[PDB]
């Protein structure tokens, strides 16, 4: 199984978690199971608390979700927790969490800054103390979403801006996309006006519908493909284009949203966060979405929304560069 654990700088208060990766289903969130191990000494009168914090570091530290559980003085135990109880011994106090739905996923902006989750344990008589960093643990966990099994409808757009005002129609091969998979678009154009097109601008953007105090819609292009195709009046032109977003050319760009980082290691582009129909839109967190434009300058354009996510992993994401250093 190889359960994960972290020890505090002090020689006590080790915390065991089965996995630092919690699948964020659309309607429910996986519980944060695990146990905390503490010696019989050093806890003669003090009480142990475990706190889960959902923060929005941008350096202050804006708080989103705060949960606290009391372990020693006092719900069924999961299978993983039962095995940890048997192995560690009697002096192990299990703790469980229940993350509410519609919370923002673990995601950071490339320069850290972003949304990070931390599990912290406490040793104090109550919650009104200024504990030191030495007698605590700061373990970062993740809350990520994965591509759904059912594919979505094929995106389609249409614009008729200036006989026939420059008919434009675009479509995608499929709605779902994986990181690194090429994206194919259609630029089927039936021009009829006297004006002719000069350049076809096809780009993939990464919307950051992110709110901390005011709603914002920052635009960050991720991929470009300049086309040198021109058309004549009353002529038909239609050919496919290929795009593949990746981080190699986007390193210089600032403010790009990247997947949650446990350490200073690099991650890929932030996966698109899909929500439920309706619901609130003031979620204090990073919201990533992708779509591709097909702009024809003479300037007509179309928008084709799509989702760029990951398939369901088999065992676990490594959360690090597997061939590190």
């Amino acid at each position, epitope marked *: 199984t190889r359960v994960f654990k972290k020890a505090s700088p002090n020689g006590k208060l080790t915390v065991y978690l089965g996995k630092r990766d919690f699948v964020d289903h659309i309607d429910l969130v996986d519980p944060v199971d695990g146990v905390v191990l503490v010696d019989p000494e050093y806890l003669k009168e003090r009480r142990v608390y475990v706190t889960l914090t959902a923060a929005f570091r941008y350096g202050f530290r804006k708080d989103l979700f705060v949960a606290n559980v009391q372990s020693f003085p006092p719900k069924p135990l999961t299978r993983l927790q039962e095995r940890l109880i048997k192995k560690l011994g009697e002096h192990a106090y299990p703790f469980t969490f229940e993350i509410p739905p519609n919370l923002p996923s673990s995601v950071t902006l490339q320069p850290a800054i972003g949304v990070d989750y931390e599990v912290k344990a406490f040793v104090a008589e109550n919650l009104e103390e200024k504990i030191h960093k030495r007698n605590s643990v700061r373990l970062v966990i993740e809350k990520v979403q994965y591509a759904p099994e059912r594919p979505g409808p094929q995106p389609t757009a249409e614009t008729t801006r200036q006989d026939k005002p420059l008919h434009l129609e675009a479509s995608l091969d499929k709605e779902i996309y994986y*990181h690194g998979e090429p994206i194919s678009v259609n630029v089927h154009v039936t021009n009829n006006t006297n004006k002719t097109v000069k350049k076809i601008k096809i780009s993939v953007r990464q919307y950051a519908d992110i709110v901390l105090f005011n709603t914002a819609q920052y635009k960050v292009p991720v991929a470009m493909e300049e086309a040198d195709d021109t058309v004549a009046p009353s002529s038909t032109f239609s050919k496919v284009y290929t795009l593949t977003p990746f981080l190699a050319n986007n390193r210089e760009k600032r403010g790009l949203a990247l997947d949650g980082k446990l350490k200073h290691e690099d991650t890929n582009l932030a996966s698109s966060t899909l929500l439920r129909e309706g619901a609130n839109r003031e979620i204090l967190g990073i919201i990533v979405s992708y779509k591709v434009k097909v702009k024809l300058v003479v300037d007509v354009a179309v928008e084709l929304p799509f989702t760029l996510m990951h398939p369901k992993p088999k065992e676990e994401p490594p959360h690090r560069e597997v061939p*590190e250093n």
Partner: single-chain antibody
Amino acid sequence: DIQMTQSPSSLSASVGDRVTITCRASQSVSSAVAWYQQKPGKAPKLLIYSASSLYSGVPSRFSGSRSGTDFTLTISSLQPEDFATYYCQQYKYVPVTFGQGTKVEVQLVESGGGLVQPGGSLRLSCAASGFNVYSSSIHWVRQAPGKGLEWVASISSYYGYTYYADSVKGRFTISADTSKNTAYLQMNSLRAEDTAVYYCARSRQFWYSGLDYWGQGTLVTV
């Protein structure tokens, strides 16, 4: 670095028995250990990619286990089409090292290779089909005649990272042609120890899980 030692150098058995191959890691690596099976005159084939997870396609008779650093491979029954060399490979660090070899007793096409005078130059092409360059990581592994597999270089087009072995640093250059879906390896300053069978293999770029697909072989003689 990390040196991986396999306890059975040469194992002999019959059909219908349990054989065990023991692999020892020099450093305390995680479960990121992969097992490969190479028939004579053929490219190695992946069997286990996480020291506990079986690859899709291979029979369930193969299994693996871990205890500290005691990675091992257990085969319940020895079918007639099982006599080959088994290699133990770790991929927790850039200098990936293969085992010494245990003897039991989507298409990738490589081009180029031939008789090259010492001090010359040669270029190897790896025609890759069925997958994208950005969605996979291309690794070059050479096998000296009578010796085990050795890692040469790797390229990750998604992050734009290129890694070279300490013995081929600077003299070797690796490049990938995304338009043609072809990976190119440049060989310069050919010394006498470069005589080996070169294999171009592709691994998943995201969440590295061993070398799934291997090439054929373009051995270079100097």
